[PDB]
Paper text:
Two key enzymes, i.e., 6-phosphogluconolactonase (Pgl) and 6-phosphogluconate dehydrogenase (Gnd or 6PGDH), from oxPPP were identified as Ag+-binding proteins by LC-GE-ICP-MS. Since oxPPP is the major NAPDH-generating pathway in S. aureus, we therefore further measured the NADPH/NADP+ ratio in S. aureus exposed to Ag+. With the recombinant 6PGDH, we show that Ag+ binds to 6PGDH and inhibits its activity in a non-competitive manner.
Attempts on direct crystallization of Ag-bound 6PGDH were not successful. Thus, we crystallized apo-6PGDH, which stands for the first crystal structure of 6PGDH from S. aureus, and then soaked the crystals into cryo-protectants containing 0.5 mM Ag+ for 2 h, allowing the protein to bind Ag+ in its packed form.
Author numbering:
A (entry chain A), B (entry chain B): 1 to 466
The structure:
Amino acid sequence: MTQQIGVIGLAVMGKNLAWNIESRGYSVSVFNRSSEKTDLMVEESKGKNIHPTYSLEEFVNSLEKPRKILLMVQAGKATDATIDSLLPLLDDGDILIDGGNTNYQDTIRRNKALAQSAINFIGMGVSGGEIGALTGPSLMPGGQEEAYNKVADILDAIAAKAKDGASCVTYIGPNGAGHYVKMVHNGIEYADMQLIAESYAMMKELLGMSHEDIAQTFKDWNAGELESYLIEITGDIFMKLDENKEALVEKILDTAGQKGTGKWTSINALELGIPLTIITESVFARFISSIKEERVNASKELNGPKASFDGDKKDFLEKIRKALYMSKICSYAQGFAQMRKASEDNEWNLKLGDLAMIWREGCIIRAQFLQKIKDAYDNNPGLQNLLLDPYFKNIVTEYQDALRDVVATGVQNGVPTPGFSSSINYYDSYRAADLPANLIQAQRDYFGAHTYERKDKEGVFHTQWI
Amino acid sequence: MTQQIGVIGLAVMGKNLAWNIESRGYSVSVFNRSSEKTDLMVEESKGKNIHPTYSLEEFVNSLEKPRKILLMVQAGKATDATIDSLLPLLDDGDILIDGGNTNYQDTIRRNKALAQSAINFIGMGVSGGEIGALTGPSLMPGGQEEAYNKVADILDAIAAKAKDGASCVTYIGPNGAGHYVKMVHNGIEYADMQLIAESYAMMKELLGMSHEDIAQTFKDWNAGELESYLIEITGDIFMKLDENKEALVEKILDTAGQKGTGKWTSINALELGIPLTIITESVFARFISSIKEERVNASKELNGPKASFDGDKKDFLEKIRKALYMSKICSYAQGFAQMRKASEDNEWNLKLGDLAMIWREGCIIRAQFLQKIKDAYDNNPGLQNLLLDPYFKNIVTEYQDALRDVVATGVQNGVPTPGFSSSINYYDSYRAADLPANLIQAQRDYFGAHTYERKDKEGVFHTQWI
């Protein structure tokens, strides 16, 4: 009567994961606190190997041991309440897998406490949306390694497969490493969408392009090095019409929503001392879009230059493309630098090459560009920055001219390019042997006696400047 | 016999603060747990009304009621340990004043906790460096409003006086509003130094100016609307020769740090939803300056254009000056927008005009500039953004052309200007009635079904995009 794995939380993503697991031949028990949605799953699953349960006691007793329970409830209170109600009914060695988009510190807290009751806790990031959950997502499980290996066959079977047959799931690391990697994935996704949107702003507001010339430009870009899911769906979005046969996306209110997780990536980067300029500017860009009424008011009081481009439009579209690809490199270089630092300060022993690997398919940021990130760390596991990898170093040293032209053209024409601007400023700061921070250091010694170091001598120095 | 006020912690700032208080004719008891710092201050206080004590029991018994105790100890656990060891020894109505660089959230915890035992707690931000604490600092006290009035005589006596006679101290607001305001002061200080540092880099790397010409430029700028303490000391710093008649500022290692306190301003901005791009990139600029040996390696593998200017240098110097002023306006507009939102969220009822008033002298960011921020809020207390203030409005719509030229030239010549770039981008985003966030919303609805709102029709919408 025992089933192989259990899922709690029968909304569309818990339901789609259970069906994915069932699609691969494993017997699944399901439970939803409100039993009426379990009653819809049984009807929507007639013929599959879905054993419904209608109490936490019948659910736990329906599962083989060590019990494998996938939590797909909403984050925060409902997750901790589900864990706490489950814990008395569990035995030593059982395994809980929180699959929500949980803040990684909650996972670290839940892993530590559950470990004192001999319960394994895996915080697993899940990316791919609801269609991806049903057919093959990218999974980022972190927690006890032994617990992971006891459920690794299920994870491997349901996860997306990259073009080399590799399943888009691997053991991330201890405790909160998986949910940390999922959060950084979303931060990268914020930047990828902002850079795409800056590209659209240039095309719409500087080159005066229509939605079909915009769509076709993105489809063209998706045929080369920039091939990504996000560029691919952007091309579809500029082809969708409304009732009046006008472009629908132009009818959408330009207030970017954000359910956190993007702001978490920058908050952590600031704590770690990691310059995450590009993802953070994309978070701030969402913030300022949400004060729509304030922007409408300032547009009637603050002057600016008219957007006027008189050069070659096709040749400048190619520059925007190069600028978009190089900004992606710098943003990923920042994002992967955050993950090495978080690996170091948490002793997670993150293998950054494995993270690019599991992001080649399934997730929202999936792109052929990620195969080149894996190739970088395969050729050099000690790679300190993606900008130094021979392939990426070759791209940025040539594309920087197109990026500089795009930024300077948008700045002079009043088109905001925050992701392009911080990209070229990151490249120029990271490659600068000497920075003006020496003036900052001398100022801090002037008004605070904070001392400074020298370039030619060694030791700590303090100057009476006046 | 009995003293009027007490200071715990006799490092240079608590020591200099105690001398300040005694200089105005008040009697002060002093305590340091490490008795050596108390003995050193005993000899240095020949002929002063400084009564040393060597136990917390003795310290509390040497002050008249209601007791006024100034905590100038290490932030964090050492502050909590002292508050804990003081609590049993105090009488209802006594006043603890924590004057360290403390996280405002700790102040909220301490204030709320000490109120249950009927003890007043003032978290007070102190700005001015070690010399400012001796002569006249800027004071940002928050806490019990009537407990402030009992110490207001002393704070007013020791604070710096603006040249209209007003002391740079005022009741900021309840609980942790004082430490919050000090924290935002520092973030603003970070942006002011970075923007001065970006001007320096432009003068040196793009215009090829010597330290003599760089010093003279800052002194001329200090003579106008940019009159500021940070610009004044910068002109001095570029005049300071080393032993071999060389500009000592150039010998200083260009590493600013990764563990400053300005990062807390950005973390709070990210949680409030306030776009703090200029201060945040000033924090990030310090991070990448900290990886010196990594930057030196990248400078040997990553190329860029060689900076070269071939136009009138004096005309461009003036454009740098306008770009610096405008960027300060944009930085402060964000910083003061952050505090307005925090005052609403924490129910502090902050009076931002009185805030700019007490920053006219004593603090590090002091400048003639802050009188215009005071004038902006006195003219319009409900002002939403300083960019809308008539005086600042007139400056930015005039100076934007110089800022755009500076940013564009800087980008085309490889000179990183993260502060200048995010300023013009912030000006172009805030004034844009329509932003490309509509594509972000469309994408989020494509892969995440997060729904969207429309510019034309009202309501919430979801679309099958393909």
